[PDB]
Each structure stands twice: as C-alpha cells, then as structure tokens.
C-alpha cells in the first residue's frame, strides 16, 4: 500500500529538456517547455 | 542554473508520480500548457 510507480523514460525525458534549457538559455522556461514537448510529440509520428 | 528550473522539473515530476499518466510527453504538453494558461 502506497507504492510509487516510476515509468521508463522519465529520467531521459527530463534530461533532454534540461540540456536544451542549460545550453540554449530560453527566456521563458514554461513557454519553452510547451514548444519543446509539442515538437517532440509531432516528431514521434 | 536559471530562475525556477528546479521548480518546473519538480512540479512535473511529482505529478507524474502522483497521477501515473499513460504517456509522458502527452502529459508534458498538457501540464505545461495548463501552467502557461494559469499565468
């Protein structure tokens, strides 16, 4: 009771976003997140 | 480290752990869009 599930690919997803933030230095991190993850999903097809 | 990066990562990550979404990137799009709209 009260186990936590860690899905596969969570760490990798976070890393990909974080590397882009630290290198590109976008001014708005939330705006960048929407754009980054939206493009990721579009490219997955 | 830029202002608020840790907070953004923690917020998303803890919600993944709490909610168990079926797809991580779908959830990311949804979660960050909500945040953008709330501001």
């Amino acid at each position: 009771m009260s186990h936590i599930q860690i899905p596969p690919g969570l760490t990798e997803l976070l890393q990909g976003y974080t590397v882009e933030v630290l290198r590109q230095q976008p001014p708005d991190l939330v705006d960048f997140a929407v754009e980054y993850f939206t493009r990721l999903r579009e490219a997955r097809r | 480290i830029p202002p608020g990066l840790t907070e953004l990562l923690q917020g998303y990550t803890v919600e993944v752990l709490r909610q168990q979404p079926p797809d991580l990137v779908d959830f990311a799009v949804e979660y960050f869009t909500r945040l953008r709209e709330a501001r």
């Binding site: 760490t11 890393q15 590397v19 | 480290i1 990550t13 709490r18």
Partner: peptide, 19 residues
C-alpha cells in the same frame, strides 16, 4: 507527495547532476 515528493526530488537532483 510524502513518498512521491521524496522520490521526485531524488529524480530531479539526479537529472541536474548529470546535466
């Protein structure tokens, strides 16, 4: 949270250390 919070913190810290 409680355990979810603790584990999230652990995961985020690991990401920040690697990046």
């Amino acid at each position: 949270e409680e355990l979810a919070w603790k584990i999230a913190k652990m995961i985020v810290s690991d990401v920040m250390q690697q990046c």
